[PDB]
Amino acid sequence: ATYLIGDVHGCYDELIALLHKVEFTPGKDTLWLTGDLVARGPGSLDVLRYVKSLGDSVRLVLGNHDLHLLAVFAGISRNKPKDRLTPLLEAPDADELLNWLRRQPLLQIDEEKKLVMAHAGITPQWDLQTAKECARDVEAVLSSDSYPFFLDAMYGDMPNNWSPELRGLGRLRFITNAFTRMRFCFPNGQLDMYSKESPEEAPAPLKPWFAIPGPVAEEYSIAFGHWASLEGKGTPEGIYALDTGCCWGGTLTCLRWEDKQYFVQPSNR
Template sequence: MAHYFVGDIQGCFDELQLLLAKVDFNPSKDELWCVGDLVARGQGSLATLRYLKQLDSAAKIVLGNHDLHLLALHGKIKKPNPKDNLTQLLGAADIQVLVDWLREQPLMRQLPQHKIVMTHAGVPPHWDLARLEIEAELVSQALQQPDYLDALIANMYTDEAENWLPQAQGLTRLRYCINALTRMRYLHLDGRLDFACKDSPSKVDKTKLQPWFEFPRKIDNDVTLVFGHWAALMGKVEQPNLQALDTGCCWGNNLTLWHVENNEKITQKRLR
C-alpha cells in the first residue's frame, strides 16, 4: 500500500486526476490523504467531492476552512462569493448527500505506522497529541448533531477565539479549535492567533509575528505534521518533521502530492 498526501485541491479536479495518474494511484491498494479545502476557486468542486466520496475508505480527509464555509453556504447562513465557483456544487442534486458526508469528516487524522498527523492549517504548539485528539473530536461531535447549523456553523465566524483557554467550554472552546486547525498561520509572540497576515515568513517582522511551527511544540519531534492552507509558503519549510503541501494550484501554481513511502513530491501545474 502507498500513502499519498495531497495539498489543497480547491476544486482543481482535472489537475488532481493528472497528478494521481502520474503515480498510478490505485484505490484498491493505495490511500489518498487530503489536507482539506477540497472546494472553491477551481472549476471542479462538485467533481472533486463526488470523486473523493466514491473512493470510500481509500480517501482520508480532514476539513479545511473552505469546506466548513460550504456547510454555511448550503445552510443559507452565508451568501456565496462568485469567486468561489460553487454555483454548480450548491445546485447539484446530490448536494445534501455530499454535505452530510463532509460533516462526517474530522479536523485531524493520524497515520500511526509513519508517525504522521494531518490537519488543514497546523497544530497549536501548546497542544500535545492527546489535547489535539480531544479538541478535534469535540468539533466532530458538534458537526454531526442535527442542530449543527444553528449551534456551531452560524457561530464559528469570529476572530474572538484567539487564545487557548484550558477552562473554556461550549462555543468558545469549539471556535478556538476551528480557528487553530483550519485558519492558523501566524501567532503573536504571546501565543495568540493572528488572522490577518497571509504573507510568506520572509516578509514578516518576527518581533511581532512568527509562524506557528517556529514555536516550541509539545507534540513529539519524531511526529511529522502535514498541513496545507498556506500557499505563500509554496511548500518550503525548514523543519524535517513538517510537510507543507499547499502550493497554490488554485492561484495558478501547482498541486502537490507527497508519496510517504518514497518521501517524494510530485507536482501538477494548474491547467487554466
C-alpha cells in the same frame, strides 16, 4: 503506497492527472487530503463526488473553505460568485455530498507512520491528547442535526489563546481557527488571525506556528495545507507544507510518504 495532496480547490483535472502520474490504485494505496477540496477552481462538484467515492482509500481533513461551503449550504452564509460553488449547490446529489462532507474529521493521525494531518497544522499550545479531544468536540457538532447553529457561531477571531478552561462558543471558535485558519503565532503560541503573507514578510515577533516548538511536532511529522503563500517552502524537518497554490495558478503537490518523493502537476490555468 501513501500519497498526500494539498489543497485541491476544485481543480479536478489537475488532481486526476496527478493521481494518474503516480498510478494511484484504491485498495493498494491510500490518499491523504489536506482539505479545502472546494471553491475557486471550477470542479468542486466533481472533486467531492470522486473523494467521497474513495471511501476508506482516502483520509480527509476539513478546511476553512469546506466549512464555508457547509455554511452556504445551510443558509448561514452568503454565496460569493468567486467561489464557483453554484453547480455543486444546485446538484441533485448536493444533500448526499454535503452530509458526507460534514461528517469528515478535522484531524488525521497514523501512529505507525508517526504522522499527523490537519488543514492548517497543530498549534504549539496543544499536545496530542488535547488536539484529539478538540477535534472530537468540533466533529461531534458538525455531525449533529444542529450543525447550522455551530457554523453560525464559528465566525470570529477571538479568543486566540488556548486554555483547558475555555467553554462554550469561545472554545469551539478557538478550536476551529487553530485547525483551519492558523498561520502565525506570537512567541507564547497565541494565534494571529490577520497576516496571510510568507514568513519573511511578517512583522516581529510573529513566527510561523511550526517555528514554535510544540509537543506534537516534537514526536510526530505534521502535514498540512492552507498556507498557500508559504509555497510549500521554509519548513523544518518533519513539517510538510503541501499547499502550493494550484487554484491560484501554482501547482498541485503530491508527496509519497514511503520515500518522501514529490510529484507536481502544473495548474491548468
